[PDB]
Design a protein around this nucleic acid. Structure first.
Lengths: 200, 93, 84, 164, 79, 82, 72, 80, 69
RNA sequence: AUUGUUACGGACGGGAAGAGGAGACGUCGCGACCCUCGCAGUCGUUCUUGACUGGUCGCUUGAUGUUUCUUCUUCCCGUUC
């Protein structure tokens, strides 16, 4: 067969991702998948390679697996990856975001975007988002964390909103802070006690 | 704008009017060509220079050497026939 | 780099001769010169090579080699070529 | 090393041989001193890119291997090789200008693949081997390979043909 | 206004075209121009029934292409 | 503007061969060049595909029906490109 | 005095005769309308292939580039 | 035959291209220049005839090709 | 737009060779940008005369040898 | 300290022989009794610069595009069933 030859080529000497290309790009499909993945496992732990693998894989489960693989060994293009994770989450959103963060902790815009999903939440896509939120909550919750990580005032507000969907926001405000503390107290209360807290 | 815009209604008044009508209300038409050809199809789109798009394209031509007539046929659909080759088109009842 | 040939068969045609030369000189190294510049024939041909070593080798080996009846007199060029 | 696809890919196909055609390929890092001990395998990697002038000289090629269409390797240079026998049905019409100098063609019967040349090989030269030293070798060549115009730089004349 | 516009919008799709010589040649459209200067990536040829004598790449001029086929079965032009 | 046209203009006073739709291959001097590819020649030979070759004093050729126009090897890189 | 386009205009809603170079066939029908590029549209069209008719077509359209002439 | 995924006429300048004409005579040559009508200046023209079986050869021109009668150019092999 | 240089060929007899194997001949009187050559003679090919002056269309004038250099 | 896109046994082929494909026009090749004599050709004019560029004869059955007219038998060599 033609596979044996390919294998031999791969073995004899490394040609700077040439053998891999020969294996995968000529076939691609199953065979190609088998090849490229194997190659990845063997030697190269590059970002581009990972991306390629992911593309090849591209169902939801498969995508997730690909993402996981990418996450395993990825130093240079971490921020970029994080975006991908976030996207995946949106389509396990909160979870995805968390994963992205873990991969590459620069990332203010991304954080803001993530928050805005929370705001929106407060059809399939929507469902996915909801699921992600739920996951985050379970983990905790996630949105709040993201906000904290992340303009600051805006983030705080977002967190508060998420909590309401408010208490969390109040807490954050208090932490930041006397007025803030009072606000937090009020949120917590949310009658006389609440009023008192607000006053404080 | 107006120099090109006034040319839009020039199809429906002049010799393209019939073809426009055909396009509007899809009906079969007999299309001839240069090197011994007869095509039959129904109209769908239209432009300035007779570059038409059709449906249910039945082709009838000859590839017979030595003066023997052979009518070969094959179904084509959703073409893009350029205006330089189109000679005669006509709306049949 | 260049090697000035001499004492060869003038009766053979130009293009053909050039081709023959190319065929001959491919064993030593990469022949840079595609066609002859003089256009006089009768031995006078400058075989331009990429490497000097290759040229040297050619000079060594093909000195008085049978090419179209007569023995070719190999020798190093006086001036450097326009391409080199 | 062995003639693989990767090697072929690597090869410098930039500087075209300006005598005829285009793309004078030199397989591996350099076909001149590549040291291809086995037969020319993985010929499909080139895929009939380009006279072509696939200069595979200064190698250790045991047998001449081809795999392409009628216009793919006219000016093939296999100089200073160990060519024992070069029988094949792939390169029928293409290979006219065959530079097979300093080969290991021993017997006249070894050239029987090239012989019966009316259909077997449309053109072929061959020279500078052990078979050239044999008695009545040129004549034999003339008899068998009529398509051989230039026999070791000197042409196959009418008189010669008559003699053979 | 024009139906070259339609052609322009199509990208990465196989289409047969019968030339003045008379060959059915399926290929990808690539960067289509306002002058109909097509470019095909993979193609099947018949040099003067269709005999197989195919080459890979080719650059087409717009004056030759009289008919085009199989972009995709859908009609949309105005935007 | 057209680079080929420019090239043609540059090559004024050079031996330029020609070929038409019918295939009549000429070879002589170039007199003048324009935006439309209108060529005029001097001391122009004529070797047609039919057989009856001739030697003509002058000729003018219409641009639309020319198949190709020959140029020598001198004006290749300089001084037209950059 | 009498120019071409005005003549053409005049000849509307009247019999017209037209011929082609490639596949010489005389088309006979009554003219409908024309444009700046001299394309044609006929009614009651009879496709006379060198005298003998192929079939009565009816309402037809003709491109300019092929047309040889316009007659009665 | 090796040729990379080129986009437009500008990216494929200075390459050995085949060219086909209306009558059916095959050409070869390196593409030097560009124009509105694709009047592609060939570096060296080896024209080929096929009678109305087998292809012939010529070697007269190093031509400026005109764009009226060209059918479709084809890439042969890259230089250098 | 650009005028063809036919002022050189004024008042000189020209042996034309138009499309479709027809050798017409006549002296040049007037010219233009479209190449509609207004010439004042017409003798067809052996030889016989058919009308004096003849204005010709630009598309159907391929080759034109000047008799007087 | 610019680039891109959009809008305005039977068959087939080749070679040879016998019996009832040929002539023109050019365009590139195998031989040479010829020419010509060398490392990057000829001449005008002035102490260094401007112009112009493999030829001829056989083929003793070399290749090839227009353009007019009108196959059978035998042997040898390859492919296929």
């Amino acid at each position: 067969d033609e596979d044996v030859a390919f294998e031999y080529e791969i073995q004899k000497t490394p040609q700077n991702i040439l053998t891999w290309k020969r294996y995968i790009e000529y076939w691609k499909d199953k065979q190609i998948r088998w090849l490229y993945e194997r190659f990845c496992s063997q030697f190269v732990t590059d970002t581009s390679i990972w991306e390629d693998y992911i593309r090849w894989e591209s169902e939801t489960s498969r995508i997730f697996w690909l993402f996981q693989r990418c996450l395993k060994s990825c130093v240079r293009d971490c921020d970029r990856i994080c975006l991908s994770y976030l996207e995946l989450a949106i389509e396990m959103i909160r979870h995805a975001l968390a994963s992205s963060l873990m991969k590459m902790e620069m990332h203010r815009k991304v954080w803001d975007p993530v928050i805005k999903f929370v705001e929106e939440k407060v059809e399939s896509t929507d469902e996915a988002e909801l699921i992600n939120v739920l996951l985050v909550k379970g983990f905790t919750i996630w949105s709040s964390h993201i906000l904290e990580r992340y303009q600051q005032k805006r983030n705080e507000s977002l967190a508060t909103l998420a909590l309401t969907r408010n208490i969390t926001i109040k807490s954050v405000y208090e932490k930041y802070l006397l007025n803030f503390n009072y606000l937090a107290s009020l949120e917590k209360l949310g009658d006389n006690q609440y009023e008192e807290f607000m006053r404080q | 704008a107006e120099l090109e815009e006034l040319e839009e209604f020039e199809f429906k008044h002049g010799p393209m009017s019939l073809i426009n009508d055909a396009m509007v209300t899809r009906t079969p038409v007999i299309i001839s060509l240069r090197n011994n050809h007869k095509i039959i199809a129904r109209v769908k789109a239209f432009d300035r220079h007779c570059n038409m798009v059709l449906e249910n394209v039945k082709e009838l031509w000859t590839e017979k050497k030595g003066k023997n007539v052979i009518n070969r046929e094959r179904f084509i659909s959703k073409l893009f026939l350029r205006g330089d080759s189109v000679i005669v088109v006509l709306k049949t009842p | 780099n260049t090697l000035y040939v001499s004492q060869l068969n003038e009766k053979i045609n130009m293009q053909r001769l050039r081709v023959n030369l190319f065929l001959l000189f491919a064993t030593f190294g990469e022949v840079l010169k595609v066609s002859m510049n003089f256009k006089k024939q009768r031995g006078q041909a400058f075989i331009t090579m990429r490497t000097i070593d290759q040229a040297s080798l050619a000079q060594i080996s093909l000195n008085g080699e049978r090419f179209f009846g007569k023995p070719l007199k190999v020798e190093f060029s006086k001036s450097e070529t326009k391409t080199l | 090393m062995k003639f693989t696809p990767s090697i072929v890919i690597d090869a410098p196909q930039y500087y075209v041989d300006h005598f005829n055609g285009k793309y004078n390929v030199d397989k591996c890092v350099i076909l001149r001193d590549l040291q291809l001990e086995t037969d020319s395998e993985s010929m499909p990697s080139s895929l009939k890119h380009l006279t072509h002038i696939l200069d595979l000289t200064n190698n250790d090629l045991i047998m001449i291997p081809d795999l392409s269409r009628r216009d793919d390797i006219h000016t093939l240079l296999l100089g200073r090789n160990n060519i024992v026998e070069v029988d094949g049905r792939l390169l029928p019409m293409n290979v006219q200008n065959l530079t097979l100098s300093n080969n290991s063609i021993r017997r006249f019967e070894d050239l029987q693949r090239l012989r019966r040349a009316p259909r077997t090989l449309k053109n072929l030269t061959l020279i500078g081997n052990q078979v050239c030293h044999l008695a009545n070798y040129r004549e034999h060549v003339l008899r068998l390979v009529p398509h051989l115009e230039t026999l070791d730089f000197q042409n196959v004349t009418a008189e010669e043909r008559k003699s053979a | 206004m024009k139906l070259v516009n339609f052609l322009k919008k199509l990208r990465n799709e196989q289409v047969t075209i019968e030339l003045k010589n008379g060959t059915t040649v399926w290929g990808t459209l690539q960067s289509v121009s306002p002058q109909m200067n097509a470019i095909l990536t993979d193609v099947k040829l018949t040099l003067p029934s269709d005999n197989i004598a195919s080459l890979q790449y080719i650059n087409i001029r717009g004056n030759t292409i009289r008919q085009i086929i199989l972009p995709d079965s859908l009609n949309l032009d105005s935007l | 503007n057209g680079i080929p046209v420019k090239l043609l203009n540059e090559a004024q006073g050079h031996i330029v061969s020609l070929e038409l739709t019918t295939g009549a291959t000429y070879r002589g001097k170039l007199v003048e060049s324009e935006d439309s590819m209108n060529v005029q020649l001097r001391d122009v030979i004529a070797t047609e595909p039919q057989g009856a070759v001739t030697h003509m004093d002058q000729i003018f050729v219409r641009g639309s029906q020319i198949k190709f126009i020959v140029v020598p090897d001198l004006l290749k890189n300089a001084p037209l490109f950059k | 005095p009498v120019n071409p386009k005005p003549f053409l205009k005049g000849l509307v809603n009247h019999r017209v005769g037209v011929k082609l170079k490639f596949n010489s066939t005389e088309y006979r029908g009554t003219l409908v309308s024309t444009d700046n590029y001299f394309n044609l549209q006929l009614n009651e069209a009879e496709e006379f292939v060198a005298g003998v008719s192929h079939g009565t077509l009816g309402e037809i359209f003709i491109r300019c580039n092929n047309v040889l002439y316009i007659r009665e | 035959i090796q040729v990379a995924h080129s986009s437009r006429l500008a990216n494929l300048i200075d390459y050995k291209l085949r060219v086909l004409t209306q009558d059916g005579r095959v050409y070869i040559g390196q593409l030097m220049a560009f124009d509105k009508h694709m009047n592609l200046v060939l570096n060296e023209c080896i024209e080929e005839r096929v009678p109305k079986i087998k292809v012939e050869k010529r070697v007269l021109g190093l031509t400026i090709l005109r764009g009226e009668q060209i059918l479709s150019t084809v890439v042969e092999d890259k230089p250098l | 737009v650009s005028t063809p240089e036919l002022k050189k060929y004024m008042d000189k007899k020209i042996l034309l060779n138009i499309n479709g194997s027809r050798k017409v001949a006549g002296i040049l009187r007037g010219y233009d940008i479209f190449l509609n050559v207004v010439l004042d003679d017409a003798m067809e090919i052996n030889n016989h005369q058919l009308g004096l002056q003849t204005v010709i269309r630009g598309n159907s004038i391929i080759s034109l040898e000047a008799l007087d250099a």
